[PDB]
Amino acid sequence: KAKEIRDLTTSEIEEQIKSSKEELFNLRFQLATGQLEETARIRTVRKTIARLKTVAREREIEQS
RNA sequence: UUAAGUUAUUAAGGGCGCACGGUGGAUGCCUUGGCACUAGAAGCCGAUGAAGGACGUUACUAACGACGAUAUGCUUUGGG
Ligand SMILES: [Mg+2]
Ligand SMILES: [Mg+2]
Ligand SMILES: [Mg+2]
């Protein structure tokens, strides 16, 4: 997904980070209430956030 | 029939031999780990926060390895 992230503006990366952290929060609450059963979504969102923060840092290090 | 004399049978248990079991982990075979060296290289890191740790990170969860809230991992360049 790193290629897809790389085409987003910096603010959009920040917007996707927040919404991904919101989806991840919702998945954990579903899991704790025994309602998710689709447990592979948790790791997918987690690594997506990692990729989003990786690129944000990359560009914040190319600018400075 | 009696008298005199002689000598068995028993095995509660024991002994010896034999047969069949149990226990135990010697012995043989084996190696995942060691021991002693040879050759080439390297030896010491730290306020740009070390050595060593604590606590955490996996869908489930104790310990160990790995990793650090980007956590049982992220990007990239090559290999495969
Ligand atoms: Mg008897
Ligand atoms: Mg015996
Ligand atoms: Mg594990």
Side-chain angles (χ1 to χ4, degrees), chain A residues 1-2 5-6 8-13 16-21 24-36 38-59:
Chain A
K1 199 171 141 21
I5 292 162
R6 213 99 57 172
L8 317 158
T9 195
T10 274
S11 161
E12 279 198 296
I13 291 175
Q16 255 286 334
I17 285 182
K18 263 184 266 278
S19 60
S20 265
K21 288 195 173 114
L24 173 62
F25 174 87
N26 286 320
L27 290 166
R28 306 248 211 230
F29 264 48
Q30 288 160 230
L31 182 71
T33 62
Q35 301 222 286
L36 174 55
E38 208 155 311
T39 44
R41 286 164 81 186
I42 288 167
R43 193 182 177 283
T44 302
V45 182
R46 282 184 89 232
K47 298 314 164 187
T48 290
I49 292 145
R51 290 191 203 81
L52 275 160
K53 301 174 149 272
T54 291
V55 167
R57 183 70 204 146
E58 278 186 333
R59 306 220 287 241

